[PDB]
Amino acid sequence: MIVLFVDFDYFYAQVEEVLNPSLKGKPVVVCVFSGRFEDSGAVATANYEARKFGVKAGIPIVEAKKILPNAVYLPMRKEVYQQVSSRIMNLLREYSEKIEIASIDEAYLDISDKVRDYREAYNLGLEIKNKILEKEKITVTVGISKNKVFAKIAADMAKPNGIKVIDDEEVKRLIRELDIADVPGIGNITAEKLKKLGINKLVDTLSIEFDKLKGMIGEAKAKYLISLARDEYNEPIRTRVRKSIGRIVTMKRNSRNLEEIKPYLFRAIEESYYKLDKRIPKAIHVVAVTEDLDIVSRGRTFPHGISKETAYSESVKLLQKILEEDERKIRRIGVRFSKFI
DNA sequence: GGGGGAAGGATTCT
DNA sequence: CATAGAATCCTTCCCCC
Ligand SMILES: Nc1ncnc2c1ncn2[C@H]1C[C@H](O)[C@@H](COP(=O)(O)NP(=O)(O)OP(=O)(O)O)O1
Ligand SMILES: [Mg+2]
Ligand SMILES: [Mg+2]
């Protein structure tokens, strides 16, 4: 194929820069405040200014304020960003039928039936980067290659405000040279396992007895890596269908007291049903994060859709099944719905 | 042996 | 100190044939 991947640059923070251009050049930090104490919570993302000082997606806000006490700290306005993304996504649908929207700020475009080589594909990418920059004033990064994974690797390398092709011949090179922990899907727990077997490059998975590989990292990840190593990974650009909807909130204080937890759980069901927007679910899961930050959950599938009134009743049973079977106190509580009609 | 699908946890991603 | 939405995977279990 020919895949052109787009990922928006420091997206939530960049949208706050468009809406308030006096922030450009200072470090901007977009925060998810949790309500326990002043500045409790996590950073959703930060602009590249702030990243230079190690403030980035995932770290505590209190930690970010020690490093960069004079950054701008905004609360996340997810709905604002979703609407700007939808507009950018609508802009991208004008460059192929086949488009896979992979998150709030990425899309894969199968542009095979639309250009014939990589310099065509490179030019279309420059076109895409300029429209997005005219219509919405957002800079993005483009990766182009022969499949989705190496398109995404290409943008990862070219960040930020970049465009990069990985032709067939560097896909061969990267199969030998690229640190395997830079392959999408290889997080920290898989990486150290791969390295405990002396696997550092994609090509290294061809010279291992397969079941040692399957034994350590699981059957699906082994075939995934071997597929890329063999330059035969191909996966279609597909339309993504939302398979679950849910909400999880953080409680002012920890607790395993049912009457104390219920209002948070119930807010989370209420919001999930708004979000459900006429989709009807057969499955419900209750998710708790314990005081030691373990995640535990209890669900149930029904033979029929769940009314709101049933979700309320059943999620209290599933939360009690949690409080029965585990002794830790609860820090975060949420509900998730799946198996729509 | 295996179709199925659950359930609970792990891992990764944004 | 440790947000939040969501997918896919693994293991075990179960319930038939
Ligand atoms: N850990 C997190 N927690 C909450 N929100 C997050 C998050 N990680 C990402 N997001 C939200 C906010 C992120 O902005 C948005 C896009 O995530 P990316 O494309 O992975 N990172 P960005 O676009 O920010 O910078 P780059 O230029 O490096 O892509 O998703
Ligand atoms: Mg991005
Ligand atoms: Mg992204």
3-class secondary structure, A162? coil
Task: Describe the strand order of the beta sheet including A295-301 as a list of residue ranges.
Answer: A244-255, A330-340, A281-290, A295-301
Among all chains, which residue has been given the structure tokens 């993504």? A240
Helix (H) or strand (E) holding A246: strand A244-255
Which ligand is located closest to the Cα atom of residue A30?
1
Is residue A106 among the annotated active site residues?
Answer: yes
**CA-CA distance, A107 to A8, in Å (whole number)?**
9
A128, amino acid identity:
I
- Classify residue A291 by its DSSP letter: T
Site of tokens 């507009």: A87
Q: Which of A247, A246, A251 is nearest to A330 (CA)?
A: A251
As given in the structure block, the two tokens for residue A291 are 């005081």
| Domains detected in chain A | 3-11+79-171 (3.30.70.270), 12-78 (3.40.1170.60), 172-230 (1.10.150.20), 244-340 (3.30.1490.100)
How many angstroms is the resolution?
Answer: 2.4
Closest residue (Cα, C1') to B13 = A185
Pair of tokens at residue A17: 């820069």
Q: Quote the Cα angle for A89-A234-A177, to 5°.
A: 100
- Is the Cα dihedral A142, A156, A217, A226 positive or negative? positive
A225: CA distance to ligand 1 center in Å?
A: 25
Order of strands, sheet of A28-33, starting from the edge strand that comes earlier in the sequence: A41-46, A28-33, A72-75
A295 touches strand B (CB under 7 A): yes
Smallest Cα–Cα separation from A329: which of A225, A252, A240, A229? A252
Q: Which residues contact A330 (CB under 8 A, 6 or more apart)?
A: A251, A254, A255, A256, A261, A288, A289, A290, A291, A322, A323
Distance CA A147, CA A163 (A): 16
Given a contact cutoff of 8 angstroms between Cβ atoms, the answer to whether A269 and A335 are in contact is yes
Identify which of A151, A57, A77, A71 has the alpha carbon closest to the alpha carbon of residue A108.
Answer: A151
- DSSP letters for A166-191: --HHHHHHHHHHSBGGGSTT--HHHH
**DSSP line for A25-67:** TS-EEEEEE-SSSTT-EEEEEE-HHHHHTT--TTSBHHHHHHH
Residues with CB in 5 Å of ion ligand 2: A 7-8, 105
Per the entry, the structure determination technique was: X-ray
One-letter amino acid of A15? V
Are the CB atoms for A147 and A109 separated by under 8 Å?
no
DSSP letter at A69 equals: T
- Number of Cβ within 10 Å of residue A86's Cβ equals 12
Q: Which residue is nearest to nucleotide C11 (CA to C1')?
A: A218
Return the residues preceding each gap in chain A, C–N over 2.5 A, or none: none
Which two three-digit tokens encode residue A112?
């095979």
A247 touches strand C (CB under 7 A): yes
Checking DSSP bridges between strand A140-145 and strand A163-165, what pairing results, if any? parallel
State the Cα–Cα distance between residues A68 and A177, nearest whole angstrom: 36
| Cis before A21? omega within 30 | no
Q: Which residues of A are annotated as a binding site for Mg(2+)?
A: 7, 105
At CB < 8 A and 24+ separation, what contacts does A81-90 make? A81/A11, A81/A12, A81/A15, A84/A15, A84/A18, A84/A136, A84/A138, A85/A8, A85/A11, A87/A135, A87/A136, A88/A8, A88/A132, A88/A136, A88/A138, A88/A140
Report the C-alpha gap between A21 and A45 in whole angstroms. Answer: 18
* Helix, coil or strand: residue A337: strand
Strand partners, A28: A72
- Residue with minimal CA–C1' distance to B5 is A301
Query: CA–CA separation, A311 vs A280, rounded Å?
Result: 11
Please name every residue paired with A332 in a beta bridge, in sequence order, or none if there are none: A250, A289
- Burial (CB count <10 Å: 0-12, 13-18, 19+), residue A134: exposed
Q: What are phi and psi of A327, to 5 degrees?
A: -100, -10
**Which listed residue (A106, A120, A127, A134) is catalytic?**
A106
Q: How far is the CA of A105 from the centre of ligand 3 (A)?
A: 5
